[PDB]
């Protein structure tokens, strides 16, 4: 209380005293009082500086006050000195630029006190606090105050080495592959930097190149939203995003001047941002008009008008007319001259593009007619032909489908109701088949509409977004009406194909794919149709390419509840649900399992199944593969604490099972530990044999009609009726009518358990049976039971065989059964040979698919209701169950996921490697119809690198069989390089240079292109970059060269003086190398540690040289003419930063162990210590967000290294940068966590270092 008042009174009396001598005397008395301890120095300093009467005008009074504070400022804690520095700088800032020359000499007192505070020898406060306040109150780009002078600039200049330590080399030139490192500030397009340090000038500018690259790539909508922080909560109205899209449009027109895919991508992309209120259409148009004005070069005018028409047609009703007026100004600038524009040729798709402006005028005029008067939009004088041609075409009653006139009418008259029913009717009646006769469908007693010709893809691309929404709404309404009507007539194949082709457009996501799962499927489910549901599920399985993971998981849950309830005890529906679920589980990505399963820990049973053990095992296999590829468990040896525990426990509580040793040995460690416990006892082979024999004897002794049916179909009895069947066919080779009746009453959902037990019974019987004639007889019986009698399907039988838990010889005979069943009979081989010969996988370019489908099904009919057994029973029984519509699938397409699983099991078991070669040779052509062959090859080689390490012939055979089976359907050079086709041998440096260069040119973007262009809407990869990365990885994996050699060669591409890799572009090569080596398995990217150790032991860092200044040249690769040693030292650091930038958190978890056990015992000099700080510095932020524990190890390792270097070295020349880095780390990342172990290390340091870091403990 009275301390502040008394000091203020004394100082104010001093202010009012006109005697400077008395002023000095009273200051001296106050100084003596502070010296003797009468008053707290912090309170005295605060009161003196915060005194209001103290003004710059009284120059002698100001100087004496600042002299007093300078004398007595040294007795304050560091936090106080920081606060007094804050208030002093605030007070100094009030000084104007120009002052009198007679008071300058007396105003230096502020400079004297600020210099004393900033002095490092005094160590009053940590220098990080001082630079933080200076940087906070002086932002980047502000000149220092003239009174302060160059002292502040030099002090800030002291911290650049720390800024370079905490910076990633070549960050602005690193680009990702679109599928927290790439986050940007929404307001300024700037990287989020930690702390207030003088970073490089390149980090203070927007990342326009990065944002443009992400925007240009297809399917980058979600990534852009994540990068810019758009939460989809309200109208963000992001100005930088709007400007980038406008510049992208300008650049597209620039390319158009002296491109169709880019224009389609723009029209497809910038619709979403405008529709979600992220950008404004009128503001976009005005900005585009202003930018394009005065430049000319007008050749992409038709494409730009096509882009604008999408909004003009799709949002005219829900927006005011005032927002679309500037389009007229855009026309005035973009279309010169007054001559009548000629009518283009209507036979080309570009005719729709050339009529875009006319359609815009029609929409605008119609919107003007609504709410008439006020304003009227007249016709331009140069659109008379375009208007008359449209009206004359409208007046025509008959319209043909050989031209694009109907597309022109739909695009122009999509708003007026009266002039739109006729073109819509003419467009939908060609696929609805309302008047034509009826066609047969595969199966028995199934008919559909006569339409077989769907709408062509190029015609669909010629329509507009609004027309496509109207078409898809009409199709959906007709489907719902048919579902409610309960009619036995199936939908037209043309309607189904057109719907599937329309569901690949992302602009209709509001009701295209969202309404397909949210509304249409539940409506058909409640309507109890079972015919449309089968059609939609088959459409999902065989005609869908790109679907978001959450939609896929949602349909997985819908499939599981559909199979669980609603009494879906039909063979066709049950098989369709099982096949769709198996494909959906298998096709899951590696980086999508955790984010899509983390939201279902509330009710895991929604996604997990209740009775399908095969589906549960498939989910477990996918989970193990994803966790292995993503390196999730690297660092943690316990499964508890992760999301997998709840899912695995729920699986074990639903379908308990065991795992084979060879299959379990490839699982990650936590999964192996989980399955070591939770082991379920299994049935004995003697017990199973005795039970089957006793039941079979009971079957002989029983003669009553009802007793057999009521006994062998009981629920809860052991599922061993298939074993009864098998035993009757090897004892008597005939089945009675009672057996057919039992099979009919068991049910599809109950026969699965019988198949499961039959597989184990089947394996045990071959194992204990004489080979030769008995083996040939017993495989002939199985062939008859599969094809001749139609008891079980081949795909389900092989899947159940491959999902068993046998060991050793039992596993060998189990896989030998699959071998014999697949190859020894001629049935499957003939079916696959025919299908591959006369079919093609490109379904989006075909028009006779139904005819080819009918031809195959007529040649090879499919039975799903025990038709063969029904006919072969001695009294011929007749079955008249209607067949659900079948449009796309067959046995060959259904077997594909089972064949992938079979390959994996054959790879797991060692003594059966020769069988896989024979399997691939005979049935390798079936991969022509695979959906993700390259991704499957990448996953298979990545997962089984250890097992395929010593077997290169099998690896090459697998790669060639999968890849070369599609060589007649894609352009040359799509996957493998020319050198590989001529050599496959030790690859040389040129091979790796060209391999990396292919990805570099693909990412850069070139007109010829290393890889051929493809329609990514119907491809497994969204962008060329992902395709290039995966094919490069697959080729490198298939190389018969050790992983260490491959990694060394890839590093040597940059780190050795080599042609074909020019300077001024080395960062792009480093980025490509980092991406490739990160995607490669562990033995490939482990050579980085060895290379770092080699540079650490280099004489460049080991030498006790007398360099003046900070050694900047060793850590920056963009330097002047460099010697070999310095060039290698800087290039290794840059390459390490590039690799670690693209690495996952599991891959980064090995750095603390590497520092602790490798670098620590060999770091003994200041240069090695600085090199380690440069290497591991910039990546502490990543550990802060995911793995907190690794921070503690890194911090103690750094202090241990500092202790070792201090003890070994006589003196240190760069104490200040080390001090600043440790202070920065403590105040930003680690904090107070490390205290006890820090004190022990600090106490043993030299007195100079102890004085420098006396504030770490506090």
Numbering used by the authors: 54 to 232, 239 to 317, 327 to 1052, 1061 to 1334
Quote the original article:
One function of Mediator complex subunit MED23 is to mediate transcriptional activation by the phosphorylated transcription factor Elk-1, in response to the Ras-MAPK signaling pathway. The MED23 subunit is the largest subunit of the Tail module and is specific to metazoans. The structure is composed of α-helices that engage in HEAT-repeat motifs, forming five solenoid regions which are designated as HR1 to HR5. The overall shape of MED23 is that of an arch with a concave and a convex face.
To validate the approach, we first determined the structure of MED23 alone by cryo-EM. We obtained a high-resolution structure of MED23, in which most of the structure is defined between 2.6-3 Å resolution, except for the N-terminal region, which appears more dynamic. The structure is comparable to the previously reported crystal structure, with the main differences lying in the first N-terminal HEAT-repeat (residues 1–50), which appears dynamic. MED23 core is composed of HR2 to HR5 regions and adopts a triangular shape in which HR2 to HR5 coil to position the C-terminal HR5 region in close proximity to HR1, which protrudes out of MED23 core. We also observed that the 501-516 segment located at the HR2-HR3 junction is disordered in MED23Elk-1, whereas it is structured in MED23, where it folds into two short strands at the molecular surface. In MED23, this segment contacts HR4-lid and the HR2 region, in particular helix H19, and is therefore ideally positioned to detect allosteric changes resulting from Elk-1 binding. The closed HR4-lid region is not predicted to be a protein-protein interaction site in free MED23, whereas the region of MED23 exposed upon HR4-lid alteration has all the characteristics of a protein-protein interaction site. Overall the core of MED23 and MED23Elk-1 superimpose well for all HR regions (with mean rms deviations on Cα < ~ 0.6), except for the HR2 region, which appears slightly displaced upon binding of Elk-1.
